[PDB]
Amino acid sequence: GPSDALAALSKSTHFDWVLAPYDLTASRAHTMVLFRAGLLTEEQRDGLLAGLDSLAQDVADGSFGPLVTDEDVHAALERGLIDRVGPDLGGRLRAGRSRNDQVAALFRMWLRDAVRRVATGVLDVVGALAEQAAAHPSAIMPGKTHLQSAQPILLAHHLLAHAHPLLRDLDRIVDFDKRAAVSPYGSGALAGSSLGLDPDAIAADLGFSAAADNSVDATAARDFAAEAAFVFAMIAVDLSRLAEDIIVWSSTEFGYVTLHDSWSTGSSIMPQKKNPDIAELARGKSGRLIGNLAGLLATLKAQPLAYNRDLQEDKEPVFDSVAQLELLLPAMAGLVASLTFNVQRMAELAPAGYTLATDLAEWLVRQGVPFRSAHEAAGAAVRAAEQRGVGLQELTDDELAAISPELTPQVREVLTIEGSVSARDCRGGTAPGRVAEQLNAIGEAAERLRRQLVR
Amino acid sequence: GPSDALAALSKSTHFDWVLAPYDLTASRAHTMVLFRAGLLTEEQRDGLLAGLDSLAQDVADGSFGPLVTDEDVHAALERGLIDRVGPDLGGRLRAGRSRNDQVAALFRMWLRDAVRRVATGVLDVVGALAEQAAAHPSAIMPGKTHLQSAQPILLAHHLLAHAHPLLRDLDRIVDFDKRAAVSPYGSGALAGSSLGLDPDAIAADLGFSAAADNSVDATAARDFAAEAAFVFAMIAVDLSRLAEDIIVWSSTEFGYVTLHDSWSTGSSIMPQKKNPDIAELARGKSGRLIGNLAGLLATLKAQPLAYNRDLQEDKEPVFDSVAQLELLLPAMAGLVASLTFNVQRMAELAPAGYTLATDLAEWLVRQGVPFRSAHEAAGAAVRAAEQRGVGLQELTDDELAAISPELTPQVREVLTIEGSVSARDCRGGTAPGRVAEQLNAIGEAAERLRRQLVR
Amino acid sequence: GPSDALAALSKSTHFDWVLAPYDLTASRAHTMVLFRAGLLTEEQRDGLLAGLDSLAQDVADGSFGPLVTDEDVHAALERGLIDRVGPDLGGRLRAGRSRNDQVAALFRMWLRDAVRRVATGVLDVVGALAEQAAAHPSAIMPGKTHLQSAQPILLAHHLLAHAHPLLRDLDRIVDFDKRAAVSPYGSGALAGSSLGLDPDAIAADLGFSAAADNSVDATAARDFAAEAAFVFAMIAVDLSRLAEDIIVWSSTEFGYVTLHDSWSTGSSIMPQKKNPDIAELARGKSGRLIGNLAGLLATLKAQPLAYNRDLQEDKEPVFDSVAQLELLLPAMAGLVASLTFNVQRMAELAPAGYTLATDLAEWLVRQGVPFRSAHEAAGAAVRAAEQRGVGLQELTDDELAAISPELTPQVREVLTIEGSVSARDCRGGTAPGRVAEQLNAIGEAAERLRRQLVR
Amino acid sequence: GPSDALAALSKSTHFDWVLAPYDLTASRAHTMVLFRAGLLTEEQRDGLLAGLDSLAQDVADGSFGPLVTDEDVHAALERGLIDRVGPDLGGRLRAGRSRNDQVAALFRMWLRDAVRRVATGVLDVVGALAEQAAAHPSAIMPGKTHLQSAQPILLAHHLLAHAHPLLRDLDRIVDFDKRAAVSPYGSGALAGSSLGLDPDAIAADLGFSAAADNSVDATAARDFAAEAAFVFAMIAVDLSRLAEDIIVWSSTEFGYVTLHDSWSTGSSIMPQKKNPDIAELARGKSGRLIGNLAGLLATLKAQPLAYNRDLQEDKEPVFDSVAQLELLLPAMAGLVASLTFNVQRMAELAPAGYTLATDLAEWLVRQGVPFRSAHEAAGAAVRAAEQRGVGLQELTDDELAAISPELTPQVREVLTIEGSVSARDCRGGTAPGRVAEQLNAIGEAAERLRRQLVR
């Protein structure tokens, strides 16, 4: 038999046990296949189905599990079934079975459930962002580029900017599932079943949308796994951007947010210090999921057709990525929802460094003023204001008129932070009216995606 | 100004010159924005458009190019426009423009063209595979698993198993393009234009399907780039599988194919010796493109909002992945199309090592024979035929009966390679009838995907 | 208290239990630190050390394990220690302890043991290659370039070509360990201990070679972990090259090797067919380990100083790469040792396709013949022999002289594979004499590395 | 002849031209090899060297360059040589020459120069960190963990914490070089030369430390390139950490540093705003270089021996990584050197949030106080101070005694930031006396490493 080293290397039960319910489902399906093929009596069919039901119970309550001598989840469950119905009846399921189309089938069935648990977690983070945005619809903050202050924006606009990538990831999940929903069952070892079974019927029975077009491709290809790994990596990277904002916002130097005691760690002695651990772990684990993706693609690279044992490595990186997101998504959702925003802090910084001189120039350009001239006017305003040690808004009607006759008192409309943001009122802009329309569209987009994922 | 070290680091003209036509298109669109805003006269507008067409022609024929002092393609083209219409009229274009929404828009426009040049190449490889499959409808070869002979399959079936993944890649391009087709123009530096422009109209004019929902996300996010890099990596990996097959097929030990003089390297000395360099470069370059993807995700990880100079690193790995595929796809297409298949060699190998013993057992199982018993029967036939040193087909009826009474002479239906493949006649199977249907659907699917990419 | 989602995300006991013995060692060392600091009596010291000995024994035999409520291995062992010596004495260990320098220390300690287990496995694969080379000192095979036959080479030369990379990997482990062998203990949370302890003393105690130069870098940096991940990935890639050769050699088309029943998979039916699963799993897992490395660098990227929670992600990729290599190296070693080389098959193929014409041409060059003429002479020789349907060796003295007067009957020195390989007698060449020296030197180099890796 | 698609794919002159001087050097070396072998007269020899000298001049001044029809740098220089000495004398150099050992040799030669250009740049960054640390010996800042304030540390300690990883990288370069300095010249196509040349002599001639042990390994393996990719990635990741700090330090919220106008970008409008573009590009390109490494390992994975065209792909990712670092290192050195540290700001922040209560508790523990007693005492002192709205040092002797008899007035020696950091006086700690020793040791280590890289 196999050497100890071979058996230890090829054993998959430490990770594949999560496929057990799907294996049992496939076995139930296969019992029907054999019945339709006249290869099982009704007595045998019913006996096999009873045994499988009993096995499913024992797997579910943990009274049945793998032994060290089981190579994989399928072998464990075959042993379990034989223990329950005897070797004669139990062994009858081996007819018309293959191990290559089965393993591909189970991974897809698992993945289509997995991607929807992830999707539900993503919708929860989108929900938490939308909820904070609706709760703070008028808070103004500095808009950052290069982590430096540029144009004032609504906090709500910044928060929702983290929802749109996740909505795109949900869209990626929907697109992915169509590809995932093709059944390889009936493709056999590589060349197609010779049993005369019906791939289309089996596919429907197992919850797939269709059966495969080419048995060799159905059993050999794993681009569905690579794609899922990419979507999971993308989601993780998108969380890491949100995470980076929160980590920086949380610093006492920024002080934009206060973390909740239950969604952070804290000091034994320093009373008010809280650490953004959840965000940090999101940040760190995004690198992990990138690695899972890169490594799976390298595993798939230069595979000759058809099935090779390399392909056993398809599952663990994807299993890992899903398990990480299942932990990260509820943790990030709660972190976001429990944030306290320090609105005076953010608003105070928003007009600093004469950033509103940009708005002044843009206003001038809108009046028909040449851009260079506008710029010069803005510079004059900045220098004039700096001399008196006041903000631009505190410049007198005479001082403004002095700099340029185009600088009418009406320019003060964009020399407040409210006035600044309100002027940015095109689609996608940070003006309150647009952000309100953006927020409603997010609610509808999310609901539409959610319903697309209903099977 | 900038130190030499800073200027050298941030200079992008060595790769961004391919954006020049898109930058000119954007500038034409912005001339219209400004005219709609009443910020340009009809004379000024016509002067700018005419000057842009002068500059465009001088870019197209290489008259106009960047200088060492130019930092980026936009600055170069602004210099060019100013040379052509004077600084007074030229400078008027600066009104209402931002860099950050512009650079995101240009990359998307370039990418929607690039992904279509890639798609055309992909369709050519699919076509070369279809071409070789159609030319050899009845040739049978060994079906490999673990690079060991299993069930005989049609050569066409194997070839087409490399076409289905590519069709899926095409499907991925179609899905990606919908996300790519969203315009950031009008989002400004991050907060949205204050000019009063119409992002939906600018979008239409630039060839986008829609404008962005959030100015911060539109200027900061680059998941569209990561998704393109994933699709390119996946295409490359799929080519590396086809490449690996051809390299093994080409070895003198296999001798499944003879390479074409014009699509391989060889020596004058030994005329028959040909090397599959194109397939080897495909294999090697798939690694490169996995790297581009992994690296781009790592670049995007933990970016705080909004625009950071980090994001300048979005283009070069995607430009690299596209340029590589643009070399690889016609190379692989021609390599595949010009192959000589040695069908007698492949047919002779297909039934080696009594592989048809599997078909024998499967036949017995179809007859109602228990699996264990069928396998015993299969073992017996191999031994029985091995003892006489003949193929299984050559066993007499009496002998076949001796091994088992269930083994009627009818079992001979599957004891030739033609009868073996013929029995695998479910959807996706290698039977000539299914394969012809498969091949028909591939041509239709390819064309449907092609129409979906017409803009 | 922590939310359920926070507790679930931050819990590390599902992977960090392997650190338990190292944690206990650290506790013993810290008992000595506290006693030196005059903070423990001799009784308190002996009491603690006795409790830690109790705890170690219970950990070692499985009677003590983590609970669901334990966040990490250190908390579990603190619980266990208090259970054994009561809270009053057990709580006294907490004095002068910090988490961050400890977790860094433990990982390093574990990694220096782990890398030596990996090194022993690498030496076993090297030994198995050397042993197969020693058993077949004169077997000649085709030398492959592009998977095409080029110069004949000794099978031993090919086999040893897979040992040199692994020796380089061992050399990388030695170089890595000097960096690994620096203790962070006493660096505290980040700024260094204020207890007045002696990091150099503690370092020696814990098995390190030196103590760190900077408390901030000692607690924050993880480049030692990235470097280990690289070396493990390099080892995996080197194994994948060997794997690829064995997979191809194993094909029935090559028939260079026959697999062993205990080191392959197969079927009872066709006893002869065997699959190289071990090599295929090695190929697949190399992708996985490349992923682990890429992801870990992505995790370490753009970390601000000092410790961040992101750093918790340092272990799992490295643990996974080590666990995989500890399965792979004995499997590959046993796979190599079990191979049966079909030397007659390889010898028959070595001179095919008139490859010895190259040797002919080169011999002419050695005689002073101009390059291009030497080549047409060789091409002439081939076609002359092509005509007669014989080998270059069978060309009569007249035919040789006919082709060229320089082609004396002595040329036949290189027109046998034996004479061909014998001419390649410079350092590193495939001549029997050179390879025997190469093989002797490999044993010496392996022994030198082995010794460097014992402490 | 080769199709256009084949020629376009295999062409390498767009990146390989940097190998021109190394190729010329090898050609001189080979001219000697042939002379020693008596295959060149002195007239032919001196005629060749004269031609190669002319060619070297023309290459160095741009007068000679590749044509579109040249496949590679070697073919171009060969063409150029024939132009200068005529096809007869020129064509004699091809005797005893192989492509496979040559391309591995030139890459190695290039790489050993390149890694030293990189090392010098790394030493420049180390130098800039060290000079800033020397310039600011008494500045105390918040020590960060989780980007939250913990123990106070010297600014010099923090800055030097970015030097040590770089020193480790320099050490990695030294170790890598030993593996790099092995010559493949003489290994021929794969089996070793039959010319009788002397590999040890050629190696020493070309600047290598030794010649290879196995011709197959010397021509096929590329782990040396993988290792360089790793060292370059690790350097980039280490710069990305320094970069992140600078970016965050530069935010107006932190205000720890002010960037220099020549080493940052500014705003035409906001007079004081400066963006950390150099740091941001360093962060972004670190992702790029991780990708290069991952991709190269993926390229090397599962290569059968020996040379395969795959291996052409070895150069561009390494070339790219070097080219990026050669831009980044002087940019980051000058960035660091020109920073202005705002020392009042950092000092004001360092003792915030009652962080010195940790120091309080630790001081108690040093006085034999039970760990829990120390911690609730410190917590009490915080509460006491917090209600008087004062700092811990402002507690009276009587209030301290109230909280605990152990809190004698001497506890005040750690209730200033200077006294806090002064207490951390073990090796590697942030006390001024330790940091001074650390800083001196960095100077010695830097110089030692530089000497080791001198060839």
A391's CB contacts (< 8 A; 6+ apart) are A351, A354, A356, A385, A415
Q: Answer whether residue A298 is part of any domain.
A: yes
B353's CB contacts (< 8 A; 6+ apart) are B149, C252, C270, C272, C273
- How far, in Å, are A264, A448, D13, D121, D294 from residue D317 at the CA level? 41, 43, 15, 19, 10
Q: Answer whether residue C6 is part of any domain.
A: no
D334 to B301: CB separation less than 8 angstroms, yes or no: no
- Closest-CA residue of chain C to A324: C9
The method recorded for this entry reads X-ray
Residue D394 and residue D364 in contact, taking contact as beta carbons nearer than 8 Å? no
Whether C123 and C232 map to the same domain: the answer is: yes
B251 to C250: CB separation less than 8 angstroms, yes or no: no
| Length of chain B (residues) | 455
Interface test with D, best of C217, C375, C413 (most D CBs within 10 A): C217
Whether A326 and A285 map to the same domain: the answer is: yes
State the Cα torsion A152-A157-A161-A164 to the nearest 10°. -150
Phi and psi torsions of C415, nearest 5°: -100, 15
> Chain centroid to CA C257: how far?
24
Residue A108 and residue A180 in contact, taking contact as beta carbons nearer than 8 Å? yes
- D:303-332 residues touching chain B, CB 8 A cutoff: 308-313, 316-317, 327-328, 330-331
The residue among A159, A152, A134, A155 whose CA lies nearest residue A418 is: A152
> Chain centroid to CA B106: how far?
22
Among the partner residues A271, A378, A379, nearest to D354 by beta-carbon distance? A271
For residue D305, the chain C residues in CB contact (below 8 A) are 144, 158, 161-162, 241, 245
Whether C200 and C246 map to the same domain: the answer is: no
The residue among A422, A374, A429 whose CA lies nearest residue B186 is: A429
Among the partner residues B287, B311, B316, nearest to D295 by beta-carbon distance? B287
* B279/C236 Cα distance (integer angstroms): 24
Task: List A274's β-bridge partners, or say none.
Answer: A266
* A351/A340 Cα distance (integer angstroms): 22
At D382, which amino acid appears?
Answer: V
Discontinuities in chain A with C to N beyond 2.5 Å fall right after: none
Whether A255 and A307 map to the same domain: the answer is: yes
Whether C142 and C62 map to the same domain: the answer is: no
The residue among D339, D109, D323, D308 whose CA lies nearest residue D221 is: D308
Q: Does D241 touch chain B (CB under 8 A)?
A: no
Tell the residue number behind the tokens 């290039």, with chain if given: D110
Q: Answer whether residue B151 is part of any domain.
A: yes
For residue C227, the chain D residues in CB contact (below 8 A) are 172, 230, 234
Q: Answer whether residue C68 is part of any domain.
A: yes
D288 to B330: CB separation less than 8 angstroms, yes or no: no
C404's CB contacts (< 8 A; 6+ apart) are C364, C369, C373, C377, C380
CA distance C161 to chain D (A): 5
- How far, in Å, are A26, B154, B163, C284, C367 from residue A216 at the CA level? 20, 11, 11, 19, 55
Number of H helices, E strands in chain C: 19, 8
Whether B307 and B252 map to the same domain: the answer is: yes
* D146/C303 Cα distance (integer angstroms): 10
The residue among B414, B404, B396, B431 whose CA lies nearest residue B359 is: B414
C276 to B147: CB separation less than 8 angstroms, yes or no: yes
- Catalytic annotation on D338? no
* D3/A431 Cα distance (integer angstroms): 59
DSSP string, C143-159: EEETTEEEEEEEHHHHH
- Catalytic annotation on D54? no
B145 to A189: CB separation less than 8 angstroms, yes or no: yes
Task: List A266's β-bridge partners, or say none.
Answer: A274
Domain count, chain C: 3
* D82/D438 Cα distance (integer angstroms): 59
Q: Does D274 touch chain A (CB under 8 A)?
A: yes
Whether A309 and A388 map to the same domain: the answer is: no
Phi-psi region of C354 (alpha: psi -120 to 50; beta: other; left: phi over 0): left
D276 to A146: CB separation less than 8 angstroms, yes or no: yes
* A6/A10 Cα distance (integer angstroms): 6
C43's CB contacts (< 8 A; 6+ apart) are none
Residue C374 and residue C364 in contact, taking contact as beta carbons nearer than 8 Å? yes
CA distance A159 to chain C (A): 22
Residue B147 and residue C147 in contact, taking contact as beta carbons nearer than 8 Å? no
> Chain centroid to CA D32: how far?
37
Among the partner residues B148, B280, B354, nearest to C146 by beta-carbon distance? B280
D252 to A358: CB separation less than 8 angstroms, yes or no: no
For residue C72, the chain A residues in CB contact (below 8 A) are none
B301 to C301: CB separation less than 8 angstroms, yes or no: yes
The residue among D103, D88, D69 whose CA lies nearest residue D187 is: D103
* D96/D26 Cα distance (integer angstroms): 13
Q: What are the tokens at C231?
A: 């070396």
How do strand D257-258 and strand D210-211 relate by DSSP bridges?
Answer: unpaired
> Chain centroid to CA D186: how far?
32
C437's CB contacts (< 8 A; 6+ apart) are none
At D430, which amino acid appears?
Answer: T
Tell the residue number behind the tokens 């390299």, with chain if given: B247
Q: Which residues of A378-394 are buried (b: 16+ CB within 10 A; e: fewer)?
A: bbbbbebbeeeeeebee
Tell the residue number behind the tokens 């580029």, with chain if given: A145
* D401/D412 Cα distance (integer angstroms): 12
Q: What are the tokens at B362?
A: 């499967």
Q: Does C273 touch chain B (CB under 8 A)?
A: yes
Q: What are the tokens at B321?
A: 């992945």
Among the partner residues D5, D280, D313, nearest to B334 by beta-carbon distance? D5
Residue B263 and residue B338 in contact, taking contact as beta carbons nearer than 8 Å? yes
Q: Does A253 touch chain B (CB under 8 A)?
A: no
C128's CB contacts (< 8 A; 6+ apart) are C332, C333, C334, C336, C337
Whether B257 and B168 map to the same domain: the answer is: yes
Q: Answer whether residue C17 is part of any domain.
A: yes
* C8/C2 Cα distance (integer angstroms): 10
B365's CB contacts (< 8 A; 6+ apart) are A39, A95, A96, A195, B371, B374
Interface test with C, best of D41, D129, D215 (most C CBs within 10 A): D215
Q: How many CB atoms lie within 10 A of CB D394?
A: 12
Q: Does A349 touch chain D (CB under 8 A)?
A: yes
Q: Does D340 touch chain A (CB under 8 A)?
A: no
At D97, which amino acid appears?
Answer: R
Q: How many CA atoms lie within 13 A of D135 on its CB side?
A: 15
Domain that holds residue B22: 12-109+181-220
Among the partner residues B253, B294, B379, nearest to C268 by beta-carbon distance? B379
* Residue of D146, D194, D262, D268 marked active site: D146
Among the partner residues D10, D278, D328, nearest to B277 by beta-carbon distance? D10
For residue D272, the chain A residues in CB contact (below 8 A) are 353
B20's CB contacts (< 8 A; 6+ apart) are B59, B73, B76, B77
Phi-psi region of B107 (alpha: psi -120 to 50; beta: other; left: phi over 0): alpha
CATH of the domain at C329: 1.20.200.10
- Chain C adjacent subunits, 3+ CB pairs under 8 A: A, B, D
Residue A94 and residue A195 in contact, taking contact as beta carbons nearer than 8 Å? no
Residue D82 and residue D61 in contact, taking contact as beta carbons nearer than 8 Å? no
Among the partner residues C284, C289, C295, nearest to A290 by beta-carbon distance? C295
Q: What are the tokens at C218?
A: 């000692």
> Chain centroid to CA B75: how far?
34
A295 to C297: CB separation less than 8 angstroms, yes or no: no
Q: SS3 letters for chain D?
A: CCCHHHHHHHCCHHHHHHHHHHHHHHHHHHHHHHHHCCCCCHHHHHHHHHHHHHHHHHHHHCCCCCCCCCCCHHHHHHHHHHHHHHHHHHHHHHCCCCCHHHHHHHHHHHHHHHHHHHHHHHHHHHHHHHHHHHHCCCCEEEEEECCEEEEEEEHHHHHHCCHHHHHHHHHHHHHHHHHHCEECCCCCCCCCCCCCCCHHHHHHHHCCCEECCCHHHHHHCCHHHHHHHHHHHHHHHHHHHHHHHHHHHHCCCCCCEECCHHHCEECCCCCCCEECHHHHHHHHHHHHHHHHHHHHHHHHCCCCCCCCHHHHHHHHHHHHHHHHHHHHHHHHHHHHHCCEECHHHHHHHCCHHHCHHHHHHHHHHHCCCCHHHHHHHHHHHHHHHHHHCCCHHHCCHHHHHHHCCCCCHHHHHHCCHHHHHHCCCCCCCCCHHHHHHHHHHHHHHHHHHHHHHCC
* C93/C99 Cα distance (integer angstroms): 13
- Closest-CA residue of chain D to C243: D302
Whether A376 and A263 map to the same domain: the answer is: no
Largest CA distance in chain A: 102
| Helix, strand, or coil (residue A143) | strand
Q: Answer whether residue B361 is part of any domain.
A: yes
Whether A55 and A167 map to the same domain: the answer is: no
Among the partner residues C143, C192, C304, nearest to D424 by beta-carbon distance? C192
B297 to C298: CB separation less than 8 angstroms, yes or no: yes
Whether B150 and B250 map to the same domain: the answer is: yes
* A236/A282 Cα distance (integer angstroms): 7
DSSP string, C43-84: HHHHHHHHHHHHHHHHHHHTSS---TT--SHHHHHHHHHHHH
A143 to B191: CB separation less than 8 angstroms, yes or no: yes
Q: How many CB atoms lie within 10 A of CB A309?
A: 22
* Helix, strand, coil tally for chain A in percent (to 5): 70, 5, 25
Burial class (CB in 10 A: 0-12, 13-18, 19+), D309: buried
* B313/D285 Cα distance (integer angstroms): 7
The residue among A334, D243, D342 whose CA lies nearest residue C10 is: A334
For residue D274, the chain A residues in CB contact (below 8 A) are 148
Q: Which residues of D123-134 are buried (b: 16+ CB within 10 A; e: fewer)?
A: bbbbbbbbebbe
Q: Answer whether residue D4 is part of any domain.
A: no
How do strand A182-183 and strand A210-211 relate by DSSP bridges?
Answer: parallel
* D3/B261 Cα distance (integer angstroms): 9
Indicate the helix (H) or strand (E) that contains A148: strand A148-154
CA distance C385 to chain A (A): 37
Tell the residue number behind the tokens 């793998």, with chain if given: A66
CATH of the domain at A187: 1.10.275.10
- How far, in Å, are A296, C208, C317, D110, D227 from residue C232 at the CA level? 17, 22, 11, 26, 12
* C170/C454 Cα distance (integer angstroms): 13
B132's CB contacts (< 8 A; 6+ apart) are B156, B159, B336, B337, B339, B341
Q: SS3 letters for B70-84?
A: CCCHHHHHHHHHHHH
* B416/B331 Cα distance (integer angstroms): 38
The residue among D245, D127, D118, D108 whose CA lies nearest residue D169 is: D118
A95's CB contacts (< 8 A; 6+ apart) are A34, A39, A195, B365, B370, B371
* C221/A303 Cα distance (integer angstroms): 37
Whether C122 and C211 map to the same domain: the answer is: no
> Chain centroid to CA C414: how far?
39
The residue among A411, A433, A412 whose CA lies nearest residue A422 is: A433
Q: Which residues of D298-307 are buried (b: 16+ CB within 10 A; e: fewer)?
A: bbbbbbbbbb
Residue B223 and residue B300 in contact, taking contact as beta carbons nearer than 8 Å? yes
A291 to C286: CB separation less than 8 angstroms, yes or no: no
CA distance D141 to chain C (A): 11
Q: Answer whether residue B455 is part of any domain.
A: no
For residue D328, the chain B residues in CB contact (below 8 A) are 9
B235's CB contacts (< 8 A; 6+ apart) are B118, B122, B166, B169, B325
- How far, in Å, are A419, B91, C219 from residue A281 at the CA level? 39, 49, 17
CATH of the domain at A366: 1.10.40.30
- Helix ranges, A62-98 (H): 73-90
C329's CB contacts (< 8 A; 6+ apart) are C118, C121, C122, C124, C125, C239
The residue among A448, A452, A418 whose CA lies nearest residue A435 is: A418
Q: What are the tokens at D76?
A: 């171009």
Task: List C265's β-bridge partners, or say none.
Answer: C275
Phi and psi torsions of B264, nearest 5°: -160, 170
